Amino acid sequence: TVEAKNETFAPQHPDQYLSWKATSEQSERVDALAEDPRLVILWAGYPFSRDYNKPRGHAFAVTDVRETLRTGAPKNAEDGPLPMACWSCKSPDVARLIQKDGEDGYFHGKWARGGPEIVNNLGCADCHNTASPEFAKGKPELTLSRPYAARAMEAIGKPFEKAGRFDQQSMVCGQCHVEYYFDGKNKAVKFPWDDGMKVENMEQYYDKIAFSDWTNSLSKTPMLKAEHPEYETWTAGIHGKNNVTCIDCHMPKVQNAEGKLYTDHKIGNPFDNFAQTCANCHTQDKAALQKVVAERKQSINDLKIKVEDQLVHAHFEAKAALDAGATEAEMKPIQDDIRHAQWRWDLAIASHGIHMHAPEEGLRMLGTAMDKAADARTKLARLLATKGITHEIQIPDISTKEKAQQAIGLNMEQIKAEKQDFIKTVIPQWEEQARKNGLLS
Amino acid sequence: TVEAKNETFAPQHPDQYLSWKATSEQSERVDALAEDPRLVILWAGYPFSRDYNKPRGHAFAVTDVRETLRTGAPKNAEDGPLPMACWSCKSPDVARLIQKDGEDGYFHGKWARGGPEIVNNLGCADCHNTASPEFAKGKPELTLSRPYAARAMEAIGKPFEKAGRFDQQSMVCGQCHVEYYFDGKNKAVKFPWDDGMKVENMEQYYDKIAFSDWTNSLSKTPMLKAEHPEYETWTAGIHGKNNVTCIDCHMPKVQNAEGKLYTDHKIGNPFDNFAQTCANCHTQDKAALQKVVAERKQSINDLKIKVEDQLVHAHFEAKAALDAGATEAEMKPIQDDIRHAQWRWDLAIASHGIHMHAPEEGLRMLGTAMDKAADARTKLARLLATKGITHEIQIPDISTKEKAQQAIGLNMEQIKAEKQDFIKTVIPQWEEQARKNGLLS
Ligand code: HEC
Ligand code: HEC
Ligand code: HEC
Ligand code: HEC
Ligand code: HEC
Ligand code: HEC
Ligand code: HEC
Ligand code: HEC
Ligand code: HEC
Ligand code: HEC
Ligand SMILES: [Ca+2]
Ligand SMILES: [Ca+2]
Ligand SMILES: [Ca+2]
Ligand SMILES: [Ca+2]
């Protein structure tokens, strides 16, 4: 009953379909590791040290999860580093499978298993109850197609079905644009929102279940990874406090050539249509508003670099303490500090929109990260001294992405060669197979 | 021609006179050192470690400068810790003396010397050209009565006489509500704005002229003291960027009983008259806006305390290094870091309005302070280890103002008794001479 094949809806909804399809124009894929090699050190031991780009259009979600080095080059349906859950926020086929196989059945196994099943571009079924008679009549019928997201919204005291129109608008974005972790042996997507959506709430939450994402290979710290917390941070910011929704800025109401109103489905930079976005509410002109947002982006970027420099030193200083023979008991309180410092930093800046959505909250977060980075490095200086080291720990050359990846032991030549062979030969097999099974066009 | 006796104007300007006089109702004097005993440590060796209160009504400026422990108990016109310049932002008799004796004449000598001269409350001649025939007709004729403030406004490319009416309104407050230092032999008020008003600009400015306000007596760091930077920080925040003036919030247009509109001169908390302040521009209700401002206040306070705890440790750790025989050369880079860390912290939170005027900027500044505090403490830990110390440095009990003051070697019982006697006996003498000279009554 869930229709994952988006083009089904084109004749009935040409304004929404044509604009939805146009996210393919947002095609630039910017390498964030090249731009910030410190990230390779911070994420040492984790797939994000291999490959991390800025987001681009929705049209590319499927392509990009296939192509990222993070997903590797599985040789069969039970192989590869990552689980089925990596599909969850990329395609309406996820909705299709959850309905067919149930949530547990969908999450079981490896990402590689979903390859010939998850094939349509993030689309209509992700956000709309397309099976409602009202939808054909041109009403939105917004829904949460993801039960893990429905459960999260209830956990914050905001059940979707009791929510008004405007809260529901941001909630559909909130199915994917959130911080999450993989829960249980089968790695189900969960939002860590049980105690609240603030960095302090989530930190306490993860510590109480003793969860870690990975162990940093330099410091041996049990780490937490933050991912794109737009919902949580937008909530904290002044626009969210005034229930200015994701849609007010990213999906403005515009007019077709016949003067009819519709929701613009080309989801991108709100500044690209200032006249229909900020200008609905603000008297300031485009240049003046761009200048403010740019200033905040710079303030955040300057402070973020300072925190990351502290963390790079902390990881290498912990590596030096290990190399001088520090025991697990000696390392533990240091590693607790590093875990908390990096959690705070990563949640502060994992969203590329933080300087717009809640710049004051990103700044505050970075400040609390810096407090724990200070504690870690002071403990480490004292620990190193007990092992007879009283000099500054020198860092290897991390001036480019390539040097940093080399420095942490990654064989990037082999990694990329394996991935490129996977892209060359497996993806077409997946698509050929999906077409044979009627899942794709 | 400056008229420092404010009551002169009462019959011509009864609406402004009566509301100006009403700041006397804002009478609560809150002890900031009691609320945060860490301050006593950070300002060790400076008058601020003795006595520091939150501000109250303008009506109390002359009495508070007289009554603070900071000015002490001078025995004659050439005694006491502080110079004439401490009167500068308290009273229209400053304008009177500047015009009579010239600026250089005014600044010469000790605070004690101006006692029998600076006797009228902060008032009309501080902000108005009262000599103008237009003033008796009811036109404001705003003026800068302080030449150093006029110089500072020119330095930021905003000469007062070329400014529009609305720029001029906030400049009048920016005669006093600024960061300043004492320049040269005679200790003249100067605002450090030559290179701009950002924390980074002022930090570089003071470093280039190798200025310090005092040497912290625990760490022997040459320190910089920040004071109430409202003008600078208001300029950095979104309200300033939008030319919302100090007056828009703090001196709203109100109607008298006969329904005549005038500027309310009872300068206080804008939330006391929300209907004529925020509500002129905002649709949100009073409780909602209060909740937002309180939330930023707590955010800043939380982070401020983290930074302060780091600085308290740094000052004591530096004391331990010194006791362990650290050389001047060994201490120097640490002292640079402490000096910078505390400057950034002090400028961030020296203004009690920062959480309202520019919360993102106060937060940003505190993060940059934390970066330097961390550097200081890491270098300290290494230095201490070279002297055979590898344990954490224990801190004295500083859980109260009294304990903190005892710990830095203040004899508060004696300091307070000398002040009480100064207050009971010298101030009536000053007032007697002023009245005899027709300066007071
Ligand atoms: C609960 C939602 C969610 C899940 C689970 C999720 N993602 Fe994403 N992903 C997003 C969102 C939202 C973006 C765009 C925002 C951003 O990248 O900052 C994104 C972007 C991406 C991108 C493009 C940017 C980049 O990093 O190169 C890739 C590739 C990606 N995800 C792969 C994965 C992989 C691999 C996993 C499993 C570890 C995963 N995703 C799990 C929501 C999710
Ligand atoms: C990323 C989530 C998402 C995607 C995917 C999505 N929509 Fe929408 N859609 C929305 C939101 C949000 C609205 C605005 C609802 C409102 O006004 O309250 C909307 C509005 C609509 C409406 C109501 C008419 C209008 O324009 O206001 C229709 C019909 C529609 N979309 C069709 C489609 C079609 C066809 C597709 C597949 C090409 C699609 N949607 C994919 C989120 C989405
Ligand atoms: C089904 C999960 C999902 C849904 C729901 C979702 N997003 Fe996304 N979004 C993604 C992923 C994944 C990417 C990154 C795509 C890539 O890089 O290939 C992305 C990218 C973006 C970007 C970056 C676009 C660009 O060109 O750089 C923006 C902005 C965005 N989404 C906004 C929204 C808004 C607003 C909503 C709510 C109407 C929403 N998203 C709903 C998953 C989702
Ligand atoms: C008040 C207007 C506004 C609101 C509401 C809003 N956004 Fe944004 N968002 C922006 C602007 C503007 C940018 C780009 C900032 C820039 O140009 O530097 C941005 C950036 C982003 C990005 C980073 C993509 C990129 O690479 O630029 C994502 C993802 C995103 N928004 C998603 C969301 C989500 C999801 C919501 C709702 C939870 C939301 N936005 C609500 C205005 C808004
Ligand atoms: C649906 C109405 C609406 C939209 C659209 C809108 N804004 Fe706002 N904006 C507000 C409201 C409400 C406030 C809070 C201040 C107030 O009470 O007026 C605000 C506050 C702000 C502030 C001050 C707080 C902060 O975050 O620094 C900035 C800057 C700003 N907006 C920029 C933008 C930009 C840029 C856009 C376009 C990407 C935009 N706004 C679009 C309504 C809107
Ligand atoms: C450039 C103007 C200016 C200068 C010069 C100045 N002050 Fe002030 N003073 C202010 C302002 C504005 C306030 C209220 C704001 C605040 O305290 O944060 C204030 C408040 C005070 C208070 C009441 C609050 C407190 O700290 O207990 C005292 C006492 C005081 N000043 C004493 C002094 C002393 C002593 C000097 C000489 C070292 C001095 N002032 C120099 C502007 C100035
Ligand atoms: C802290 C600075 C300051 C103080 C002290 C001060 N004024 Fe004012 N005054 C202002 C400002 C600002 C305005 C508004 C000017 C405008 O509207 O542009 C104003 C306006 C006025 C006006 C014009 C009419 C009106 O109500 O707007 C008169 C007359 C006046 N004040 C009289 C006085 C009197 C009399 C005193 C002494 C009892 C005094 N002021 C003290 C700053 C001050
Ligand atoms: C002549 C110097 C001077 C001028 C001009 C001046 N201030 Fe003040 N202000 C002070 C001092 C000193 C205090 C602290 C008084 C005390 O605590 O005894 C103070 C206190 C205040 C307070 C705290 C009131 C309270 O009850 O806590 C506010 C608000 C304030 N000033 C605002 C303004 C505004 C707005 C203007 C411009 C109209 C400004 N002032 C003009 C020196 C000045
Ligand atoms: C957009 C409104 C607005 C503007 C503009 C404004 N203020 Fe404020 N200011 C406030 C509010 C509201 C508070 C009290 C915050 C609170 O209650 O927590 C405050 C606090 C203060 C305080 C601290 C007083 C105290 O009681 O602790 C001072 C001093 C002050 N303002 C002076 C100024 C000066 C000088 C200017 C111009 C450079 C200015 N303000 C501009 C609204 C404003
Ligand atoms: C002269 C008109 C005016 C006055 C009076 C005014 N504001 Fe604002 N306020 C603005 C403007 C303009 C913005 C920028 C957002 C926008 O474009 O609307 C803003 C933004 C804000 C913001 C969002 C920035 C932030 O800090 O997140 C808050 C909060 C706010 N105002 C609170 C208040 C409070 C509280 C008062 C009363 C003490 C107040 N303003 C009085 C015009 C005004
Ligand atoms: Ca992007
Ligand atoms: Ca996570
Ligand atoms: Ca006060
Ligand atoms: Ca100063």
PDB file of N, CA and C in Angstrom, chain A residues 182-241:
ATOM      1  N   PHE A 182      22.087   3.851  17.308  1.00  0.00           N
ATOM      2  CA  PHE A 182      21.614   2.496  16.951  1.00  0.00           C
ATOM      3  C   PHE A 182      21.393   1.691  18.224  1.00  0.00           C
ATOM      4  N   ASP A 183      20.154   1.256  18.422  1.00  0.00           N
ATOM      5  CA  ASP A 183      19.738   0.632  19.687  1.00  0.00           C
ATOM      6  C   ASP A 183      19.596  -0.886  19.549  1.00  0.00           C
ATOM      7  N   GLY A 184      20.193  -1.620  20.488  1.00  0.00           N
ATOM      8  CA  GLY A 184      20.114  -3.088  20.520  1.00  0.00           C
ATOM      9  C   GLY A 184      21.074  -3.817  19.575  1.00  0.00           C
ATOM     10  N   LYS A 185      21.002  -5.143  19.603  1.00  0.00           N
ATOM     11  CA  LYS A 185      21.887  -5.972  18.767  1.00  0.00           C
ATOM     12  C   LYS A 185      21.523  -5.826  17.291  1.00  0.00           C
ATOM     13  N   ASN A 186      20.230  -5.637  17.011  1.00  0.00           N
ATOM     14  CA  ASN A 186      19.782  -5.373  15.649  1.00  0.00           C
ATOM     15  C   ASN A 186      19.868  -3.919  15.142  1.00  0.00           C
ATOM     16  N   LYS A 187      20.379  -3.013  15.975  1.00  0.00           N
ATOM     17  CA  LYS A 187      20.683  -1.634  15.525  1.00  0.00           C
ATOM     18  C   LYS A 187      19.478  -0.883  14.918  1.00  0.00           C
ATOM     19  N   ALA A 188      18.487  -0.685  15.774  1.00  0.00           N
ATOM     20  CA  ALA A 188      17.314   0.101  15.448  1.00  0.00           C
ATOM     21  C   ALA A 188      17.634   1.579  15.693  1.00  0.00           C
ATOM     22  N   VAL A 189      17.177   2.445  14.789  1.00  0.00           N
ATOM     23  CA  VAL A 189      17.254   3.901  14.958  1.00  0.00           C
ATOM     24  C   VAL A 189      16.432   4.323  16.182  1.00  0.00           C
ATOM     25  N   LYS A 190      17.089   4.957  17.156  1.00  0.00           N
ATOM     26  CA  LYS A 190      16.401   5.616  18.285  1.00  0.00           C
ATOM     27  C   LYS A 190      16.885   7.065  18.438  1.00  0.00           C
ATOM     28  N   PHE A 191      15.974   8.011  18.693  1.00  0.00           N
ATOM     29  CA  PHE A 191      16.376   9.386  19.076  1.00  0.00           C
ATOM     30  C   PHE A 191      16.610   9.413  20.595  1.00  0.00           C
ATOM     31  N   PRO A 192      17.789   9.891  21.079  1.00  0.00           N
ATOM     32  CA  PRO A 192      18.035   9.848  22.526  1.00  0.00           C
ATOM     33  C   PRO A 192      17.333  11.014  23.258  1.00  0.00           C
ATOM     34  N   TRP A 193      16.018  11.096  23.086  1.00  0.00           N
ATOM     35  CA  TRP A 193      15.254  12.234  23.562  1.00  0.00           C
ATOM     36  C   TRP A 193      14.475  11.976  24.865  1.00  0.00           C
ATOM     37  N   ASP A 194      14.604  10.775  25.428  1.00  0.00           N
ATOM     38  CA  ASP A 194      13.864  10.360  26.646  1.00  0.00           C
ATOM     39  C   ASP A 194      13.938  11.372  27.800  1.00  0.00           C
ATOM     40  N   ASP A 195      15.098  12.008  28.003  1.00  0.00           N
ATOM     41  CA  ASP A 195      15.248  13.013  29.070  1.00  0.00           C
ATOM     42  C   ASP A 195      15.234  14.460  28.573  1.00  0.00           C
ATOM     43  N   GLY A 196      14.904  14.663  27.310  1.00  0.00           N
ATOM     44  CA  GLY A 196      15.032  15.999  26.740  1.00  0.00           C
ATOM     45  C   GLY A 196      16.063  16.094  25.607  1.00  0.00           C
ATOM     46  N   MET A 197      16.026  17.212  24.894  1.00  0.00           N
ATOM     47  CA  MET A 197      16.776  17.357  23.656  1.00  0.00           C
ATOM     48  C   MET A 197      17.992  18.259  23.807  1.00  0.00           C
ATOM     49  N   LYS A 198      18.251  18.711  25.024  1.00  0.00           N
ATOM     50  CA  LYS A 198      19.440  19.517  25.294  1.00  0.00           C
ATOM     51  C   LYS A 198      20.671  18.641  25.375  1.00  0.00           C
ATOM     52  N   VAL A 199      21.827  19.210  25.013  1.00  0.00           N
ATOM     53  CA  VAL A 199      23.080  18.471  25.103  1.00  0.00           C
ATOM     54  C   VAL A 199      23.341  17.817  26.510  1.00  0.00           C
ATOM     55  N   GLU A 200      22.983  18.513  27.579  1.00  0.00           N
ATOM     56  CA  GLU A 200      23.165  17.980  28.936  1.00  0.00           C
ATOM     57  C   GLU A 200      22.220  16.781  29.196  1.00  0.00           C
ATOM     58  N   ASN A 201      20.978  16.885  28.695  1.00  0.00           N
ATOM     59  CA  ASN A 201      19.994  15.781  28.777  1.00  0.00           C
ATOM     60  C   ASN A 201      20.502  14.511  28.071  1.00  0.00           C
ATOM     61  N   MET A 202      20.941  14.660  26.818  1.00  0.00           N
ATOM     62  CA  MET A 202      21.480  13.539  26.007  1.00  0.00           C
ATOM     63  C   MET A 202      22.780  12.944  26.569  1.00  0.00           C
ATOM     64  N   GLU A 203      23.646  13.804  27.082  1.00  0.00           N
ATOM     65  CA  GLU A 203      24.899  13.340  27.667  1.00  0.00           C
ATOM     66  C   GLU A 203      24.649  12.427  28.877  1.00  0.00           C
ATOM     67  N   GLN A 204      23.800  12.899  29.778  1.00  0.00           N
ATOM     68  CA  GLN A 204      23.371  12.118  30.935  1.00  0.00           C
ATOM     69  C   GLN A 204      22.658  10.809  30.543  1.00  0.00           C
ATOM     70  N   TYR A 205      21.832  10.865  29.499  1.00  0.00           N
ATOM     71  CA  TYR A 205      21.128   9.718  28.948  1.00  0.00           C
ATOM     72  C   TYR A 205      22.081   8.620  28.469  1.00  0.00           C
ATOM     73  N   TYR A 206      23.053   8.998  27.629  1.00  0.00           N
ATOM     74  CA  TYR A 206      24.007   8.055  27.080  1.00  0.00           C
ATOM     75  C   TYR A 206      24.891   7.487  28.157  1.00  0.00           C
ATOM     76  N   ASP A 207      25.313   8.328  29.103  1.00  0.00           N
ATOM     77  CA  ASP A 207      26.102   7.836  30.219  1.00  0.00           C
ATOM     78  C   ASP A 207      25.326   6.818  31.099  1.00  0.00           C
ATOM     79  N   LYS A 208      24.037   7.058  31.345  1.00  0.00           N
ATOM     80  CA  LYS A 208      23.267   6.113  32.174  1.00  0.00           C
ATOM     81  C   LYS A 208      23.097   4.719  31.536  1.00  0.00           C
ATOM     82  N   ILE A 209      22.908   4.634  30.219  1.00  0.00           N
ATOM     83  CA  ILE A 209      22.879   3.315  29.541  1.00  0.00           C
ATOM     84  C   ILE A 209      24.295   2.809  29.176  1.00  0.00           C
ATOM     85  N   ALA A 210      25.330   3.559  29.578  1.00  0.00           N
ATOM     86  CA  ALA A 210      26.737   3.292  29.216  1.00  0.00           C
ATOM     87  C   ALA A 210      26.958   2.974  27.708  1.00  0.00           C
ATOM     88  N   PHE A 211      26.347   3.785  26.849  1.00  0.00           N
ATOM     89  CA  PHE A 211      26.442   3.607  25.403  1.00  0.00           C
ATOM     90  C   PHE A 211      27.712   4.301  24.882  1.00  0.00           C
ATOM     91  N   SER A 212      28.392   3.644  23.939  1.00  0.00           N
ATOM     92  CA  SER A 212      29.408   4.292  23.094  1.00  0.00           C
ATOM     93  C   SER A 212      29.208   3.925  21.659  1.00  0.00           C
ATOM     94  N   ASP A 213      29.431   4.898  20.776  1.00  0.00           N
ATOM     95  CA  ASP A 213      29.480   4.686  19.326  1.00  0.00           C
ATOM     96  C   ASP A 213      30.735   3.955  18.829  1.00  0.00           C
ATOM     97  N   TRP A 214      31.913   4.305  19.348  1.00  0.00           N
ATOM     98  CA  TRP A 214      33.167   3.643  18.970  1.00  0.00           C
ATOM     99  C   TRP A 214      34.235   4.041  19.984  1.00  0.00           C
ATOM    100  N   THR A 215      35.398   3.387  19.916  1.00  0.00           N
ATOM    101  CA  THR A 215      36.560   3.688  20.764  1.00  0.00           C
ATOM    102  C   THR A 215      37.561   4.391  19.864  1.00  0.00           C
ATOM    103  N   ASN A 216      37.932   5.618  20.232  1.00  0.00           N
ATOM    104  CA  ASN A 216      38.886   6.394  19.439  1.00  0.00           C
ATOM    105  C   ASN A 216      40.227   5.657  19.462  1.00  0.00           C
ATOM    106  N   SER A 217      40.812   5.465  18.284  1.00  0.00           N
ATOM    107  CA  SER A 217      41.949   4.542  18.148  1.00  0.00           C
ATOM    108  C   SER A 217      43.252   5.184  18.634  1.00  0.00           C
ATOM    109  N   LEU A 218      43.234   6.509  18.805  1.00  0.00           N
ATOM    110  CA  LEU A 218      44.390   7.210  19.340  1.00  0.00           C
ATOM    111  C   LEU A 218      44.355   7.208  20.882  1.00  0.00           C
ATOM    112  N   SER A 219      43.244   7.662  21.463  1.00  0.00           N
ATOM    113  CA  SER A 219      43.141   7.801  22.922  1.00  0.00           C
ATOM    114  C   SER A 219      42.513   6.614  23.662  1.00  0.00           C
ATOM    115  N   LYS A 220      41.933   5.681  22.903  1.00  0.00           N
ATOM    116  CA  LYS A 220      41.145   4.554  23.446  1.00  0.00           C
ATOM    117  C   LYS A 220      39.893   5.001  24.277  1.00  0.00           C
ATOM    118  N   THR A 221      39.448   6.238  24.050  1.00  0.00           N
ATOM    119  CA  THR A 221      38.266   6.777  24.702  1.00  0.00           C
ATOM    120  C   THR A 221      36.992   6.170  24.097  1.00  0.00           C
ATOM    121  N   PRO A 222      36.043   5.742  24.952  1.00  0.00           N
ATOM    122  CA  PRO A 222      34.712   5.350  24.452  1.00  0.00           C
ATOM    123  C   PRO A 222      33.885   6.586  24.090  1.00  0.00           C
ATOM    124  N   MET A 223      33.674   6.795  22.788  1.00  0.00           N
ATOM    125  CA  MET A 223      33.180   8.051  22.219  1.00  0.00           C
ATOM    126  C   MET A 223      31.676   8.041  21.894  1.00  0.00           C
ATOM    127  N   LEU A 224      31.103   9.235  21.848  1.00  0.00           N
ATOM    128  CA  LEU A 224      29.761   9.438  21.336  1.00  0.00           C
ATOM    129  C   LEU A 224      29.871  10.291  20.078  1.00  0.00           C
ATOM    130  N   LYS A 225      29.097   9.922  19.069  1.00  0.00           N
ATOM    131  CA  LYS A 225      29.040  10.624  17.799  1.00  0.00           C
ATOM    132  C   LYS A 225      27.729  11.398  17.715  1.00  0.00           C
ATOM    133  N   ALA A 226      27.822  12.696  17.396  1.00  0.00           N
ATOM    134  CA  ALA A 226      26.648  13.520  17.102  1.00  0.00           C
ATOM    135  C   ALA A 226      26.343  13.584  15.630  1.00  0.00           C
ATOM    136  N   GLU A 227      25.039  13.598  15.309  1.00  0.00           N
ATOM    137  CA  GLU A 227      24.586  13.734  13.927  1.00  0.00           C
ATOM    138  C   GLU A 227      23.504  14.822  13.814  1.00  0.00           C
ATOM    139  N   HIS A 228      23.734  15.766  12.884  1.00  0.00           N
ATOM    140  CA  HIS A 228      22.791  16.790  12.377  1.00  0.00           C
ATOM    141  C   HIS A 228      21.533  17.028  13.225  1.00  0.00           C
ATOM    142  N   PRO A 229      21.690  17.682  14.402  1.00  0.00           N
ATOM    143  CA  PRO A 229      20.522  17.826  15.263  1.00  0.00           C
ATOM    144  C   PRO A 229      19.671  19.066  14.917  1.00  0.00           C
ATOM    145  N   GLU A 230      19.136  19.145  13.694  1.00  0.00           N
ATOM    146  CA  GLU A 230      18.343  20.317  13.320  1.00  0.00           C
ATOM    147  C   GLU A 230      17.087  20.466  14.185  1.00  0.00           C
ATOM    148  N   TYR A 231      16.338  19.373  14.378  1.00  0.00           N
ATOM    149  CA  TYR A 231      15.083  19.496  15.148  1.00  0.00           C
ATOM    150  C   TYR A 231      15.377  20.082  16.552  1.00  0.00           C
ATOM    151  N   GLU A 232      16.337  19.471  17.234  1.00  0.00           N
ATOM    152  CA  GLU A 232      16.661  19.793  18.617  1.00  0.00           C
ATOM    153  C   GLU A 232      17.172  21.242  18.710  1.00  0.00           C
ATOM    154  N   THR A 233      18.005  21.666  17.764  1.00  0.00           N
ATOM    155  CA  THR A 233      18.597  22.989  17.888  1.00  0.00           C
ATOM    156  C   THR A 233      17.621  24.084  17.433  1.00  0.00           C
ATOM    157  N   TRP A 234      16.922  23.845  16.323  1.00  0.00           N
ATOM    158  CA  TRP A 234      15.832  24.747  15.864  1.00  0.00           C
ATOM    159  C   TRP A 234      14.849  25.003  17.037  1.00  0.00           C
ATOM    160  N   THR A 235      14.538  23.939  17.791  1.00  0.00           N
ATOM    161  CA  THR A 235      13.650  24.057  18.972  1.00  0.00           C
ATOM    162  C   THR A 235      14.205  25.061  19.988  1.00  0.00           C
ATOM    163  N   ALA A 236      15.520  25.030  20.185  1.00  0.00           N
ATOM    164  CA  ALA A 236      16.180  25.852  21.188  1.00  0.00           C
ATOM    165  C   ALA A 236      16.304  27.336  20.762  1.00  0.00           C
ATOM    166  N   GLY A 237      16.324  27.577  19.448  1.00  0.00           N
ATOM    167  CA  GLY A 237      16.530  28.898  18.868  1.00  0.00           C
ATOM    168  C   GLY A 237      15.288  29.782  18.887  1.00  0.00           C
ATOM    169  N   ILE A 238      15.511  31.063  18.617  1.00  0.00           N
ATOM    170  CA  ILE A 238      14.445  32.046  18.806  1.00  0.00           C
ATOM    171  C   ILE A 238      13.299  31.846  17.779  1.00  0.00           C
ATOM    172  N   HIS A 239      13.647  31.437  16.554  1.00  0.00           N
ATOM    173  CA  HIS A 239      12.631  31.142  15.554  1.00  0.00           C
ATOM    174  C   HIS A 239      11.722  29.990  15.991  1.00  0.00           C
ATOM    175  N   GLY A 240      12.329  28.898  16.459  1.00  0.00           N
ATOM    176  CA  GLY A 240      11.577  27.738  16.976  1.00  0.00           C
ATOM    177  C   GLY A 240      10.698  28.152  18.153  1.00  0.00           C
ATOM    178  N   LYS A 241      11.210  29.003  19.052  1.00  0.00           N
ATOM    179  CA  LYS A 241      10.422  29.504  20.189  1.00  0.00           C
ATOM    180  C   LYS A 241       9.187  30.286  19.753  1.00  0.00           C
TER     181      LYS A 241
END
